[PDB]
Amino acid sequence: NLDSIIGRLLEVGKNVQLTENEIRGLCLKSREIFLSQPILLELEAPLKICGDIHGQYYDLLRLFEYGGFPPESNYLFLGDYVDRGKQSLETICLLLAYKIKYPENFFLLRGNHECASINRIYGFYDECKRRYNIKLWKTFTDCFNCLPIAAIVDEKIFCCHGGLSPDLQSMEQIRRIMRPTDVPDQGLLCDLLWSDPDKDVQGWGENDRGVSFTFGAEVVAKFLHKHDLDLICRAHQVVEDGYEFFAKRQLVTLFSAPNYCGEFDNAGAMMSVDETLMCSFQILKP
Numbered sequence: 001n002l003d004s005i006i007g008r009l010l011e012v013g014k015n016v017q018l019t020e021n022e023i024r025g026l027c028l029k030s031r032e033i034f035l036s037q038p039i040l041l042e043l044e045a046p047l048k049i050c051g052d053i054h055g056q057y058y059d060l061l062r063l064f065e066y067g068g069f070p071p072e073s074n075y076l077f078l079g080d081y082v083d084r085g086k087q088s089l090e091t092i093c094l095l096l097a098y099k100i101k102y103p104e105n106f107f108l109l110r111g112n113h114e115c116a117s118i119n120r121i122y123g124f125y126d127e128c129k130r131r132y133n134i135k136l137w138k139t140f141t142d143c144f145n146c147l148p149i150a151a152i153v154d155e156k157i158f159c160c161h162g163g164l165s166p167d168l169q170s171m172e173q174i175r176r177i178m179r180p181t182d183v184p185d186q187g188l189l190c191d192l193l194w195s196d197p198d199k200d201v202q203g204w205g206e207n208d209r210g211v212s213f214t215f216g217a218e219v220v221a222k223f224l225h226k227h228d229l230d231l232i233c234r235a236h237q238v239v240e241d242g243y244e245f246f247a248k249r250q251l252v253t254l255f256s257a258p259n260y261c262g263e264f265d266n267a268g269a270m271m272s273v274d275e276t277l278m279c280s281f282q283i284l285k286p
């Protein structure tokens with residue numbers, strides 16, 4: 001009942017409570033699609049690229065208002081759909097609904113919050129327990145475990161949630177990551193979901209999060225030259241303007257949840273990539 005699900009999702013802090021069976025159907029069908037597509041996506045422009053949402057469903061609707069509801073635009077999201085916000089269920093369900101309906105034009109990457117042990121702590125487990133049951137949360141977890149990890153747009157823009165890894169020598173190493181899997185505490189898959197650029201680090205550094213690493217501008221420059229890429233597009237950190245460049249525009253951080261978690265006064269942004277690989281930004285003020 002996909003059109004009916006999308007309809008009720010779009011009709012609207014006002015909740016949308018679908019049925020358990022409908023939500024379970026969303027997870028099972030999307031999971032099949034994820035596993036049928038590569039773990040390293042190879043995408044083509046034109047595309048719109050969005051950073052973190054964190055359950056801010058009303059802002060997700062804003063993004064589609066600005067960018068165009070599918071299938072008017074093509075979409076890549078970079079992860080972190082759930083936790084912290086008040087409407088993770090609505091958020092993730094519309095995302096999974098669009099993935100099933102437009103599976104060659106709608107793409108979702110895995111963020112560090114699409115991991116059971118993080119969800120457990122940061123709100124999604126609780127929202128699932130309250131509104132449905134724990135068994136549903138476990139169904140979401142199995143779906144999350146099948147999400148792809150990175151994307152390359154037109155052989156030039158490398159996309160992932162977190163950032164680079166000292167263990168990332170070849171793109172093939174990403175392709176050999178096996179799904180379903182949980183995100184480990186260390187290593188390539190961890191770093192792709194958890195690392196941060198840092199202006200004050202040279203090479204690889206300790207990350208204040210207590211997970212993964214920080215990397216400096218020369219690590220980015222080297223990565224891009226080696227792999228013949230032009231840009232790293234990532235998310236994972238709140239930034240005042242919704243996007244923010246690093247390493248002389250060789251990396252961009254995107255963040256798509258304006259007025260993040262009520263605490264910050266940030267804009268959200270969405271990046272458009274056109275057929276000539278020109279990048280522009282649409283800005284969503286809080």
Ligand SMILES: [Fe+3]
Pocket residue numbers: 052054080113236237
């Ligand atoms: Fe996040």
Ligand SMILES: [Fe+3]
Pocket residue numbers: 080111112113161193235236237
């Ligand atoms: Fe994150």
